[PDB]
Design a protein around this ligand. Structure first.
Ligand SMILES: *[C@@H]1O[C@H](CO)[C@@H](O[C@@H]2O[C@H](CO)[C@@H](O)[C@H](O)[C@H]2NC(C)=O)[C@H](O)[C@H]1NC(C)=O
Ligand SMILES: *[C@@H]1O[C@H](CO)[C@@H](O[C@@H]2O[C@H](CO)[C@@H](O)[C@H](O)[C@H]2NC(C)=O)[C@H](O)[C@H]1NC(C)=O
Ligand SMILES: *[C@@H]1O[C@H](CO)[C@@H](O[C@@H]2O[C@H](CO)[C@@H](O)[C@H](O)[C@H]2NC(C)=O)[C@H](O)[C@H]1NC(C)=O
Ligand SMILES: *[C@@H]1O[C@H](CO)[C@@H](O[C@@H]2O[C@H](CO)[C@@H](O)[C@H](O)[C@H]2NC(C)=O)[C@H](O)[C@H]1NC(C)=O
Ligand SMILES: N[C@@H](CCC(=O)O)C(=O)O
Ligand SMILES: N[C@@H](CCC(=O)O)C(=O)O
Ligand SMILES: N[C@@H](CCC(=O)O)C(=O)O
Ligand SMILES: N[C@@H](CCC(=O)O)C(=O)O
Lengths: 375, 365, 375, 365
C-alpha cells in the first residue's frame, strides 16, 4: 500500500479531551504514556495491527475544571493544531462534513435518564383519602346516631345491630341515610383524586414527552446535545442546563425538577450504563435511543491513515479483542430491573387489600373464638 | 470613534441611590470607593472594557432613613446634578423619554408576593356540588313522590313514613328508586370533577384577584410600581401602603390584611428572590411577571458615553462575566418548595336533628 | 414661543401606514387629502390648535397586500425619509429610545381574544354517558331478569313490582344485584369522565395559560407583539403565526387550534372591540390587559413640534372633542355579555334536570289519571 | 473568490432520479428542460444567485417503472458519472462520508403513518379495574363471610341464602356491609382513573409499538429507511415490505396487516403530508419525527461549486423565496382532524345465569 507514514521529527499530535466526569473512557494520568481510560487503549491496540512503528504524543485539551467543548476540539483538528482527536467524539452531521472519521468502534445513542416510579402499597394507602381526624369522627358519628337508636328502643349491645339493618327514630334513620350517601361519594372522590393526580403527575415516557413538558432538562458540559436539542427538537435554551460532574448529575435529579434542579438528563447510552452502576436502583432509561449514531476517531480531512485505521477497527471488531478491552475497563454492568417498560394502568395495590381482608380475618377469627367459647 | 471622554478637572458624577433595604445590589460603604453592591461592580467592569481612563466619583442621593424616589433620582440627571445614574433604575417609558438608558444588564419583572394559605372553604364548600336551585328541586320532588305514599294507604303521617322507608304504589317505589340512584351518581360525578381539577389548578390566583378584592397593597418606598398601578391598573391609592425596610415587609404580611397590615406586596422580581431566600417558604409569588422590562443605567440624554457602555454590557454578558459577578453577591437560591378531607357542615346536621329528638323524649317523659 | 416652523418648499412628510385590515383607524383613500381613518382626523384636529398654518403631505408606506412592519416604519423616521409617523404606533421601549413620541391620545393594551365556552344543557346531556344502544339493553336486561321472576312465581303485570322490592329466584336476585352495582359505578365513571374532560380541555384564562400551553398563537403582520412575545414571554417562534386580514383572523379561530389554525389571537384592545362588533357573540377578551401602554405620534428625535403637539393633545383631551371624533368613527361598541369572568365550578345543567323531573311529572300525572279513572 | 466554473465543452451532469410516485417534487417531463417538480425549481433559482453562467444538463437515472435506490444514485456521483445529484436526497451519515452535501434546503423527518383505529378493547376491558388476583380475594372472602350465616342458623343452604339477602350474626352483617361499600367506591375510583387518563393519553402509540409487535412494515422503493431500521433498529427484514407507487400505499393499508398488507408504513415527513392531503383523514402519523435530518443537494466531494451553492440557499431562504416556490407546488394543507360506552361482557353473564334457571324450571316441570 503506497502510503508510508514518515519517520521524521514531528510526532503524531493526538488531541486528548480533559475529562472531569467519566474518567474511565479517557482521562489525565500520571504515567509515562500520560493518559488513561478506555478509548486510549483502543487506540493503542490499533497501532499493532498496522505495520507502522508510530511515534506520537498526547496533548490534553480542556482544563481540570469542566468537560471540554468537543466542537472546539474538532475545530482544533480543523485548524491543524492537532493531527488526530482520540476520545468520545460522537459522529454528528457537521462533524462528518468538516473532518474525517473512522468506522464506529462502538455504538451509542442519546437516552433519557429519569427517576423511576415509586408507588406506595400499605393499609395506610387504603385509609389514605380521609384525614386521620376524619376516620375517627365518621366512625364516631355512627355510634352517636346509634346511641340515639337505643333511646328509640357487650351481649346487650349486640341487639341494636339487629335493628339497624334496614316513628321518630325512622326520621333519625333517614338523615343518617343521607350521611352514608355523601360519605360514599366523599370517599369515592377523594380516592379518585389521589388515583388521578398519581397518574397525571409530571411524567415522561420518551423524548416527545420531554420536549412538550416545557421543563428544565439537564445535559453535560461541552456536548453536541445542547446544540442538538436546540437546532432539532425545538427546545428553548433556558430549559437546557449544563452540568459539570457526576456528583452534580445525581443531586440535580435528587432534587427533581424543583429546588433549582432539572426534570431529566439527556446523555448518551454508554455514559448512563456507567451511571447506573455508579448509582443505586433509582433510575432507568425511560425510552429507546432517539439519536443513535456511535463514536469514532476524528482525523485530518483526507488523511491516508483513515482507511488504514478504518480497516484496523473492523479487523479488531471481528477478532473480539475489542470486547476484551471492553471487559478490562467497561465491565461495570448491572440491570436491577426495577421497572421494565411498565404499563401504567389500573394496578391496585396488593398490600392495600392486605389491610382489608386480614382485619376481616381478625374479625372472622374473633367470631370463631367466641363460637368455641360457647362450646 | 470620534468621541473621547475628556480628562479635565471635573469627574464623572455618578448618581448613587442612598439604599436602605436590600444592601446587596448597592449600599453606602465606608470603603475608599464609598460604594458596595452588585450594580456598582457591574458598572466597574464595563469601565475596564473601555479604551478610556475614566475619572469618576460617587454621591449618595437620598436620606439614609428611607429609600428615595428613583424618579427624582432620574430627574437630577435631567436637572444635570449628575452625569449618569447607576443603581436599580428600571426602564419605564417616561423614564426613557427624558434620559437615555443603556441596554438591560439584568432582567427584572413585577411580581406579587403573598403568604401561602389554605385551599379549603367553609361548611358551604361541602354543599358546593349541585347548584342550590337544584337542591330545592331535589328535596321538593323528594317529598312530592313521597306524597304518593299517602294516596296509596298524626297517625296517618306515621303510616306515610312507614312505607317511605322500605301494588301500583309499590311500582312508584320502582321508578323513584331508579331516579335517586342516578342522583347518587350525579352528586358523585359532580363532587369528583371538583376535587380533581382543584389539585390541578395552580393558577387560582392573579393580579386581578388582588385588584378586585380591594385589599391593602404594600409597596416599597421610592419605586415606580407605586405610580404604575395607579395610572395603568387604576387602583385606588388608599389600598397602596408604602414600606421603608426589609423587616417591615414581613410584619405587614405576618399581620395579614387585618391588624393594619397588607395583603400582598407588589415588588420587583430580583428583590423577592432575595427575601424568600431570607425567610421560610411561607410566602409565595402568586403568579408570573405581569410587567417585565429589566434594569439599566441612565446616562444623560444624547451622550456618546452611553453608546460604548451599552456595547460593553453586551460584550461582558456574552463573555459570561455578569453571572460570575452575580454569584459573587447573589448566589442565593435557598428555596424550599397529599389530599385529605376536613369539614364541619354535615355534622352540624348531626347536631340539629339529634338534640331535637331529646326534647320530644323529654316531652314524652 | 421661540420656535417657528418654517414657510419653505419642503412639506411635512407624514408617514402613513398602508393598513389592509382595520381601515377605520388609518387607510388609503381616493380623496384630495388622500388618507382616511381615525388618527388622521385626530392629527387633523391637532393642526387648528396650533397657530401654525402647516403645509404637509401624506405618504403611504406599506403595500396593498399586508400590514406594514411598524419597526421598519419607525426606522424610516430614524432615517429621516419622513418627518413624522401618524397612525397606530404603539409606544414600545425601543421606540421611546430611538424617536420621540407625544403624550398618548388614546390608551391600549394587549389582550387575549379566544373562543367562548359553549356548554350544553339538554335531556340528551342527562342520558349522555351511555350509548343509545346501551340505554335500551340495560333497561332490556331488567325485564329480561324480571320475566324470570314470573317463572319463579297490565294489572296482572304490576304484581311483580311488589315482589321485586327487597330459593332459586333469590339466586337470580343476587346476580341481578351485582348487575346494578356495576351499572351504578359504570354510570358514575362515564359521567365523571365527561365532566372531567370538559373541565380539563384546552383552556386559557390569561397570558400565563397561553404561554405554558405550547400552542400556536396568532398575531397580525408587522407588529411589535411578535418580537414582544419572543423577547419577553419566552415563546418559541414556531408557535407565533402572523395573519394578514380580518377575514382570515376569524377562520383561524373558527378552525380552532387544529385544521392548521391557532389557539388564540393576541392583539391590542382597540382592535378587538372593532372585531367584536365585526363578529357575532362568539369571542371575548378572556383576561385583563397584560401590556398596557397606548399609542402616540412618532416624531423626529428632539423635535420642537413635540411639546407643541404634546400640549395640543392634552388640551384637546380636556375639551372632549377627542371623544367626539371617537364618536364619528369608533362608535362601534357592543357588549353581548355571553360570559363575564365566569367561575368554572360545579354548575350542573338546569335543563339536564328539566328532562328528569318532567318525565317524573308525566309519571305522577299518569298515576293521577288512573287514580281518577277508578273514581 | 478563486474558483470560477469553466465554460468548456462539457456541461454540468446533474443526476436526476427517475421518479415514479410523488411527482410534485421531481418528475420526468416532456418540456425542453425535461424536468418538472419542486427540487428542480429550488435548484434553478440558486443557479440565478450565482455570478456564473452555468451550462447544465439533466439525466434521468432509474427505470420508469419503479423508484431507484438513491444510494446507488449517490454512488454514481462517487463513480463520477454525474457532477451533482439533485432530488430528494436525504442527508445520511455514510451518504455524507463519500460526497459533500449542501445545507438542508428543506426539513424532513422519518414518521410512521398508520390508519386510525378504535380504542375500546374486549369484554375483558370491562373487567380491567381490580387486577385479577383481587377478584378471587374478593369473591373468596365474599362467600367466606357468607359462611358465617350458616353458623348462626339443600334445605340448609337455602336458609343460608335466605339471611344472605337482607343477634351476633347480624353484627357480622354490620361489618361486611361496611367493607363492600368501600369496594363499591374502590371499583368506582379505579374505573374512573382509567376512563379519565385514556381521554388524555394521545401518546398511546410509538415506533416501539411497531417494533415489538412484529408487524409487516411497508416501505417505499429505493429509500434509506429500508436499510436504516435494519442496521439501527435491528428489525427483521421479513417485516419490511417494499412498495413501488402511491396507490399501493393505500391498498396495503386498506387490507391492514392481514390479507397480505402492511400495518404501518414508515416514510418521510414531506411525503406523508402529500398523501394525507390526497386521502381522507383515515390515516394518522402515530407519533413525531424519530429521525429528523432534512434533504440536500449532493455535489462531488471537495468541489468548490458546493460552497457558493450552499450560501445561495442561505441567502434565498432568508429572503423568503423557498416558501414562495413551496406554495407554487405544495400549498397542500387540506387535512381534516365525545366519550360513550359499548361492551358485551356483563351481558354474557346475563345470558349464562338466566338460561341456567330455565333448565331447573324444566327439571321441575
Ligand atoms: C457545525 O459545525 C461547525 C464546526 O463545529 C460549525 O460551523 C463553523 O465551523 C468553523 C470551524 O472552521 C467555525 O470557525 C465557525 O465559527 C462555525 N460557524 C458557526 C456559525 O458556528 C457550527 O458551529 C456547527 N453548526 C451548528 C448549527 O452547530
Ligand atoms: C414621567 O416622567 C416625567 C419625567 O420626570 C415626569 O415629568 C416631571 O414631573 C415633575 C413633577 O413635579 C415636574 O418636574 C415636571 O412636570 C416634569 N419634569 C421635567 C419635564 O423635567 C412625569 O410627571 C412622569 N409621569 C407621570 C404620570 O408621573
Ligand atoms: C429595538 O428597536 C431598534 C429599532 O427598530 C432595533 O435596533 C436597531 O435599529 C437600527 C435602526 O437604525 C437598525 O439598523 C438595526 O438593524 C437594529 N438592530 C437590530 C439588531 O436589528 C432593534 O432590532 C430592536 N430590538 C429588538 C429586540 O427587536
Ligand atoms: C454506506 O455507504 C457506503 C457508500 O456507498 C457503502 O459502501 C459501499 O457498499 C457497496 C455495497 O455493494 C460496495 O460498492 C462497497 O462496499 C462500498 N462502496 C464504496 C465504498 O464506494 C456502505 O455499505 C453503506 N453502509 C451500509 C451500512 O450499507
Ligand atoms: N458524545 C459527546 C460527548 C461530549 C463530552 O463528553 O463533553 C460528543 O462527542 O460531543
Ligand atoms: N426598580 C425600582 C426599585 C425601587 C426601589 O428599590 O425602591 C425602581 O427603579 O423604581
Ligand atoms: N400596535 C401595533 C400595530 C402594528 C400593526 O398595525 O401592524 C404597533 O404599533 O406596532
Ligand atoms: N428521502 C429518501 C427518498 C427515497 C424515495 O423517494 O424513494 C431518500 O433519499 O432515500
Amino acid at each position: 500500500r503506497g502510503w508510508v507514514f514518515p519517520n521524521n521529527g514531528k510526532p503524531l499530535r493526538i488531541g486528548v479531551p480533559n475529562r472531569v466526569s467519566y474518567t474511565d473512557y479517557v482521562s489525565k494520568d500520571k504515567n509515562p504514556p500520560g493518559v488513561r481510560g478506555y478509548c486510549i487503549d483502543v487506540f493503542e491496540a490499533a497501532i499493532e495491527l498496522l505495520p507502522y512503528p508510530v511515534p506520537r504524543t498526547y496533548i490534553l485539551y480542556g482544563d481540570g475544571k469542566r468537560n471540554p467543548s468537543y466542537d472546539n476540539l474538532v475545530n482544533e483538528v480543523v485548524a491543524d493544531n492537532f493531527d488526530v482527536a482520540v476520545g468520545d467524539i460522537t459522529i454528528v452531521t457537521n462533524r462528518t462534513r468538516y473532518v474525517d472519521f473512522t468506522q464506529p468502534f462502538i455504538e451509542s445513542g442519546l437516552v433519557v435518564v429519569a427517576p423511576v416510579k415509586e408507588a406506595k402499597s400499605s393499609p395506610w394507602s387504603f385509609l389514605k383519602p380521609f384525614t386521620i381526624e376524619m376516620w375517627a369522627v365518621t366512625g364516631g358519628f355512627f355510634l352517636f346516631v346509634g346511641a340515639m337508636v337505643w333511646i328509640l328502643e357487650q351481649l346487650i349491645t349486640i341487639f341494636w345491630f339487629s335493628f339497624s339493618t334496614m316513628s321518630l327514630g325512622r326520621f333519625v334513620l333517614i338523615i343518617w341515610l343521607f350521611v352514608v350517601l355523601i360519605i360514599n361519594s366523599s370517599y369515592t372522590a377523594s380516592l379518585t383524586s389521589i388515583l388521578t393526580i398519581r397518574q397525571l403527575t409530571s411524567r415522561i415516557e420518551g423524548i416527545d414527552s420531554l420536549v412538550t413538558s416545557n421543563e428544565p432538562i439537564g445535559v453535560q458540559d461541552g456536548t453536541f446535545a445542547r446544540n442538538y436539542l436546540i437546532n432539532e427538537l425545538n427546545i428553548l435554551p433556558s430549559r437546557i442546563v449544563p452540568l459539570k460532574d457526576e456528583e452534580q448529575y445525581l443531586s440535580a435529579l435528587q432534587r427533581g425538577p424543583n429546588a433549582g434542579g432539572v426534570a431529566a438528563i439527556v446523555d448518551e447510552l454508554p455514559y448512563i450504563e456507567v451511571l447506573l452502576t455508579n448509582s443505586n436502583c433509582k433510575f432507568r432509561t425511560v425510552g429507546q435511543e432517539f439519536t443513535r449514531t456511535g463514536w469514532g476517531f476524528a482525523f485530518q480531512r483526507d488523511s491516508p491513515l483513515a482507511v488504514d485505521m478504518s480497516t484496523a477497527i473492523l479487523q479488531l471488531s471481528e477478532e473480539g479483542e475489542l470486547e476484551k478491552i471492553h471487559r478490562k475497563w467497561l465491565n461495570y454492568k448491572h440491570e436491577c430491573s426495577m421497572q421494565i417498560s411498565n404499563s401504567e394502568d389500573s394496578q391496585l395495590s396488593l398490600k392495600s387489600f392486605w389491610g382489608l381482608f386480614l382485619i376481616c380475618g381478625i374479625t372472622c377469627f374473633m367470631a370463631l373464638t367466641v363460637f368455641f367459647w360457647r362450646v
